[PDB]
Design a protein around this ligand. Sequence first.
Ligand code: 99C
Length: 187
Amino acid sequence: GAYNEWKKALFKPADVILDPKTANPILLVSEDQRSVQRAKEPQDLPDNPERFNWHYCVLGCESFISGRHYWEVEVGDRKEWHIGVCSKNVQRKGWVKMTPENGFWTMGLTDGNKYRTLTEPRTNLKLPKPPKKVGVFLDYETGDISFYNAVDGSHIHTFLDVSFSEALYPVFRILTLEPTALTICPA
Ligand SMILES: Cc1ccc(C/C(=C\COP(=O)(O)OP(=O)(O)O)CO)cc1
């Protein structure tokens, strides 16, 4: 389809590799560092300064300060997940609302069937069909972050015209304990 045929002409495929040292201890990152799950119990890990210790987030290793980039995530049948990008300098220690004002640009799924944009305040999405695979797209210069259904090419959401002052990481958040992982598809 056009989404498959054109995306690489417009956006550089990011090889997103999950960074274990950022992951809240309640998350488990696969050996191959492409998948993240929620665990029954905290891993025995240090509170090193890269680690999210309140939100259940994990980042990719590589950040971006420029250009056009995209990666894809298998959300599959998980009932709960949020993904997006965040500033290098977000508050990783202690509570903060994941908003654009606080350097998170994310959308996701709660409670099986309630898709929403993590704006302040939050905001419902009506999706025709439920995505099994989301494409996340960043254009640093224009300031656009967009999500697409990466199978059928449908638009999910765009944050328009954000002024970035910072390096941006891919970010992923899962709250619930569930058979299906969040998994990054390489190119
Ligand atoms: C089981 C469970 C574990 C942890 C939490 C608090 C978190 C996010 C929720 O942040 P909040 O602002 O309350 O909701 P939202 O970011 O989804 O809107 C963890 O990242 C909640 C539920």
